[PDB]
Amino acid sequence: ELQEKLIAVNRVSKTVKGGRIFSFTALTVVGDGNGRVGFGYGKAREVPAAIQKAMEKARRNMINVALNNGTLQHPVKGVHTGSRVFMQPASEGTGIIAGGAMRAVLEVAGVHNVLAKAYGSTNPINVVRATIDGLENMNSPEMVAAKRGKSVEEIL
Amino acid sequence: XXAXXAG
Amino acid sequence: ATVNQLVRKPRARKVAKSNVPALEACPQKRGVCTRVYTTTPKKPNSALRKVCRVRLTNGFEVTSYIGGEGHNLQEHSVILIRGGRVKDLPGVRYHTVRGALDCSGVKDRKQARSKYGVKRPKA
Amino acid sequence: ARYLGPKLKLSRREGTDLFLKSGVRAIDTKCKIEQAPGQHGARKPRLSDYGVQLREKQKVRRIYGVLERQFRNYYKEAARLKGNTGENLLALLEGRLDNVVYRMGFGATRAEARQLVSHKAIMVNGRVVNIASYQVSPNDVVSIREKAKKQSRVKAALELAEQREKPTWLEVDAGKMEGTFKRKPERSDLSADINEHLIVELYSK
Amino acid sequence: SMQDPIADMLTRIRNGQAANKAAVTMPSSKLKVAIANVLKEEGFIEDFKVEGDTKPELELTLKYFQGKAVVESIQRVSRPGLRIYKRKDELPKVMAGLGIAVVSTSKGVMTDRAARQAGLGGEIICYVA
Amino acid sequence: KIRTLQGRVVSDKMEKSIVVAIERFVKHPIYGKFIKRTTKLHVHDENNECGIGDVVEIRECRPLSKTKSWTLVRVVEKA
RNA sequence: UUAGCUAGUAGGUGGGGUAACGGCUCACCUAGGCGACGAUCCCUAGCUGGUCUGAGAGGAUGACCAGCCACACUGGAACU
RNA sequence: UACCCGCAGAAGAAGCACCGGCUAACUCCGUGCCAGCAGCCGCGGUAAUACGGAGGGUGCAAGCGUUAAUCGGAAUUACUGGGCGUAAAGCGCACGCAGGCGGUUUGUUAAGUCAGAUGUGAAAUCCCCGGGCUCAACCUGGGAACUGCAUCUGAUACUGG
RNA sequence: GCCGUAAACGAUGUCGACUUGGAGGUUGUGCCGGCGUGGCUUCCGGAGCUAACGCGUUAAGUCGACCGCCUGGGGA
RNA sequence: AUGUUGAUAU
Ligand SMILES: [K+]
Ligand SMILES: [Mg+2]
Ligand SMILES: [Mg+2]
Ligand SMILES: [Mg+2]
Ligand SMILES: [Mg+2]
Ligand SMILES: [Mg+2]
Ligand SMILES: [Mg+2]
Ligand SMILES: [Mg+2]
Ligand SMILES: [Mg+2]
Ligand SMILES: [Mg+2]
Ligand SMILES: [Mg+2]
Ligand SMILES: [Mg+2]
Ligand SMILES: [Mg+2]
Ligand SMILES: [Mg+2]
Ligand SMILES: [Mg+2]
Ligand SMILES: [Mg+2]
Ligand SMILES: [Mg+2]
Ligand SMILES: [Mg+2]
Ligand SMILES: [Mg+2]
Ligand SMILES: [Mg+2]
Ligand SMILES: [Mg+2]
Ligand SMILES: [Mg+2]
Ligand SMILES: [Mg+2]
Ligand SMILES: [Mg+2]
Ligand SMILES: [Mg+2]
Ligand SMILES: [Mg+2]
Ligand SMILES: [Mg+2]
């Protein structure tokens, strides 16, 4: 059902009396392919368990993206920490024109056609967060019509 | 010095 | 910067700088070896790295690296230099072209022969 | 400007039958199709995004026998032409004469079909064409020449074509030894194994 | 000193929305009222009203939908330090047409939709979304 | 209509000539701000009517001196 | 890390001159004219259509092709 | 001459770079911080996928590499599109000329601004739909485009007078 | 009389507008110990902002005007 | 009160 995707595995270290304790972080995204997407970040001493932890977190932290026929409603800007992402609706058969972290979010979310650019830090975690922040705060015509107290064709 | 250590 | 500030003083571009100024925007230059010698690399490397001081046709004096195992250069050898620093010889910004002018190709070389001026073994 | 080397080691790298032998017998009997070529063949390393994309592009190229410069020009064309770039690319490759001559069933392989075209044994709407890369357009008759109809290569190939699946976009006559290129193949007509978006990504990066 | 009362109105709305204020009150002006109409008609604010003679006070009643404020963003575009004028062909679509650009045309202040229909360009006052 | 420019008089000290500043107002090509851009013209003023301060209409004409190819049409405003 | 530059200089009148307007030239008169919207001075440079790159805005560039300019051993001069 | 026809015979026709990560491709031997490699990080100190050779492999292919040079990636001069408490960055503080900017109402003007029209924006080039060289490159028909400039005539909300 | 610089620091330019609170200090004032209302100021903290530390109506929040300044480390 | 230093690479 859900498309699970591993974005980044990273080795991290705490020092102790003995020396360095290494451990693994795994950043994953899960999505249905119809505008429901969630990222998970898991830590463990081994890579498998980090991933299994990441996937479990991702499934419980999915949000709803209001898509428009496999692309975005409008241009969106996401920011998290040092990651400033920009995403634009594209024509059919564009594909996802995006960096690898944004690519994975957009693929599993069900965005087929999009022009994306990551400005600033391309730190995988913060890029993923900025992207999903972007998607979740993208307005559709229906909710815009709703809030403004109009019809969809008055808006469009 | 010592013409170049820690013992 | 305010718009009025930019109107008064526009954005200056980063001027940018050659790492190979003695070539003077030429792919190669010829020169004459004044000294051919060895020198030790910086940390963490240890070697006797084969360099030559070279007087180029355009008057510049530069150090150039001699790559490959063994060479035939002496003082008053005419050689061709190209761009390319040696990371662990500070000051060395050029490589000699093996198998151009008086510089011979490397003896008994078989792989990457075009890089070291070595004609194809007759098979 | 052609691959003249061993054909099965191409297939073994891709891990897939690329039809570079006639199909008189199974690929399994002629080589270890499972194992990749060479000393470290049994090793199956974890392949990167780039490696996946590369291997996909190299698969499609190796089927149609297109070298990289010419393949990239097809991509540039496919991107220029309107529609979905990926399906445009596969259309252009199917449009090639040496492919059309194979698809109808005159060559056993595409390299044989390429030898046919090369050696002035093919005609397109009357005229002799000895260019493999020639784009055969819709409503075009492709024909064996009368001197070339006596070849055992052509008859033997036409038998193997019956064992293969028939192109819906081609109508052929085995007796007359000529066929019409009716229309451009749709993506549905071509195999689902090819992941054309990977090739688009590869050139789009 | 005060040198952009429009930016000040937009800011009073922006801040007032963030602070979940019911209404926001600025000093009035003809151009402020003209903008307030476009925000009313497009359904971003609920109502407005001018009050006074010597010193009139505009008073916008703000909208909230499902808890959230309706004005998602509201950006000054043309400003004293840099005036932006657009021709009819180059009028901006805010949020792919889901938001408005308030445009001062020769036939008064209006949305970029209304300006496209009227075949006019003009000064781009603000975006709203 | 005949083509004319209009501008302020900035000098009247020349005999039968004035300097006229044509104030233009131009979008900056890069930065988009609207900029005042003067252009000064030596202008023929037969009779020597105009003085510094006066707005004047002017038209282009044949060369009259080294620097003059513009003539006074009318004084629009005076100081 | 060039701030002042300019006396045919800037304008006028008349005579001369040019195919032609004109300090183009001359005599006399006036004392102007140019400049921080960068004059003057210094360095570099043929300009454009275009070319390369770029999502664009830009950045870089001006080989071939075509338009314009300039030069013809160096300096100067006219003649036809 | 293009092109066509005939002849004979696989005959006359494959290299270059790369394989530690970035980056597609791994083993053995030799060497032992030496010899050497290196775009960046780095590799070599006696068990080197990084040197040198070999075998195998990967990528390109009548080319392949290397060097030079431009733009890109570089939002790393940020107009579009950046910053300045501590990362580089607020003048030690003020007054103030030029400059930039300017509360609110009415009228007027029409400079900015906007609208329309006309002229111009050489041809080639680019782009689109066609055509011609067996194909392609290349050549070429018609368009689109040339985002500009000027002139005239209107609009008057905003900015300026 | 000259010098003209300091970690000359809040390492935070000036002016204006707007945006939950709490506890003080100091200096006016109005109404009758309480109840307001001004100025300046110390500490905490909310949203928001911030790489984080923190800032937080005296902003490093939300905006406008103008100025100053930065563009890897060194060389300097 | 005072009270120094720790060769190179890894
Ligand atoms: K000592
Ligand atoms: Mg960065
Ligand atoms: Mg070729
Ligand atoms: Mg005269
Ligand atoms: Mg003249
Ligand atoms: Mg020159
Ligand atoms: Mg860009
Ligand atoms: Mg130029
Ligand atoms: Mg690999
Ligand atoms: Mg060994
Ligand atoms: Mg380069
Ligand atoms: Mg840039
Ligand atoms: Mg920065
Ligand atoms: Mg410091
Ligand atoms: Mg600092
Ligand atoms: Mg200060
Ligand atoms: Mg002051
Ligand atoms: Mg005003
Ligand atoms: Mg006008
Ligand atoms: Mg054709
Ligand atoms: Mg044409
Ligand atoms: Mg043209
Ligand atoms: Mg007015
Ligand atoms: Mg100081
Ligand atoms: Mg300070
Ligand atoms: Mg606090
Ligand atoms: Mg010590």
UniProtKB/Swiss-Prot annotation, chain C:
Coiled coil: none annotated. The keyword Transport does not apply. The modification 3-methylthioaspartic acid is found at residue 88. GO terms for cellular component: cytoplasm; cytosol; cytosolic small ribosomal subunit; ribosome. The modification N6-acetyllysine is found at residue 107. Transmembrane segments: none annotated. Changing residue 87 to Q: Confers low-level resistance to streptomycin and a 15% decrease in the translational elongation rate. Keywords: Acetylation, Antibiotic resistance, Methylation, Ribonucleoprotein, Ribosomal protein, RNA-binding, rRNA-binding, tRNA-binding. The keyword Metal-binding does not apply. One of its GO terms (molecular function) is tRNA binding. GO terms for biological process: cytoplasmic translation; Group I intron splicing; maintenance of translational fidelity; positive regulation of RNA splicing; response to antibiotic; RNA folding; translation. Part of the 30S ribosomal subunit. Contacts proteins S8 and S17. Interacts with ArfA. May interact with IF1 in the 30S initiation complex. HAMAP family: Ribosomal_uS12_B (MF_00403_B). With S4 and S5 plays an important role in translational accuracy. Belongs to the universal ribosomal protein uS12 family. At least 19 substitutions or deletions in 11 codons can promote streptomycin resistance, dependence or pseudodependence; all but one of the streptomycin resistant mutations (K42R) are associated with hyperaccurate translation and thus reduced translational efficiency. This is Small ribosomal subunit protein uS12. It comes from Escherichia coli (strain K12). The gene is rpsL.
Swiss-Prot record, chain D:
Transmembrane segments: none annotated. Part of the 30S ribosomal subunit. Contacts protein S5. With proteins S3 and S5 encircles the mRNA as it enters the ribosome, which may play a role in mRNA helicase processivity. Some nascent polypeptide chains are able to cross-link to this protein in situ. The rRNA transcription and antitermination complex (rrnTAC) consists of RNAP, NusA, NusB, NusE (rpsJ), NusG, SubB, ribosomal protein S4, DNA and precursor rRNA; S4 is more flexible than other subunits. HAMAP family: Ribosomal_uS4_B. Residues 95-155 form the S4 RNA-binding domain. One of its GO terms (biological process) is negative regulation of translational initiation. Changing residue 50 to D: In rpsD101; suppresses a temperature-sensitive mutant of release factor 1, R137P. Not a ram mutation. Keywords: Antibiotic resistance, Repressor, Ribonucleoprotein, Ribosomal protein, Ribosome biogenesis, RNA-binding, rRNA-binding, Transcription, Transcription antitermination, Transcription regulation, Transcription termination, Translation regulation. GO terms for cellular component: cytoplasm; cytosol; cytosolic small ribosomal subunit; small ribosomal subunit. One of two assembly initiator proteins for the 30S subunit, it binds directly to 16S rRNA where it nucleates assembly of the body of the 30S subunit. It comes from the Bacteria. One of its GO terms (molecular function) is rRNA binding. Belongs to the universal ribosomal protein uS4 family. This is Small ribosomal subunit protein uS4. SMART domains: Ribosomal_S4, S4. It holds the Pfam family Ribosomal_S4.
Curated annotation (Swiss-Prot), chain E:
GO terms for biological process: cytoplasmic translation; regulation of mRNA stability; regulation of translation; ribosomal small subunit assembly. Pfam families: Ribosomal_S8. Keywords: Repressor, Ribonucleoprotein, Ribosomal protein, RNA-binding, rRNA-binding, Translation regulation. One of its GO terms (molecular function) is structural constituent of ribosome. One of its GO terms (cellular component) is cytosolic small ribosomal subunit. PANTHER family: 40S RIBOSOMAL PROTEIN S15A (PTHR11758). Belongs to the universal ribosomal protein uS8 family. One of the primary rRNA binding proteins, it binds directly to 16S rRNA central domain where it helps coordinate assembly of the platform of the 30S subunit. Part of the 30S ribosomal subunit. Contacts proteins S5 and S12. This is Small ribosomal subunit protein uS8. The lineage of its organism: Bacteria, Pseudomonadati, Pseudomonadota, Gammaproteobacteria, Enterobacterales.
Swiss-Prot record, chain F:
GO terms for biological process: cytoplasmic translation; response to antibiotic; ribosomal small subunit assembly. InterPro entries: NA-bd_OB-fold (IPR012340), Ribosomal_uS17 (IPR000266), Ribosomal_uS17_bact/chlr (IPR019984), Ribosomal_uS17_CS (IPR019979). Keywords: Antibiotic resistance, Ribonucleoprotein, Ribosomal protein, RNA-binding, rRNA-binding. Gene3D superfamilies: Nucleic acid-binding proteins. SUPFAM superfamilies: Nucleic acid-binding proteins. Part of the 30S ribosomal subunit. This is Small ribosomal subunit protein uS17.
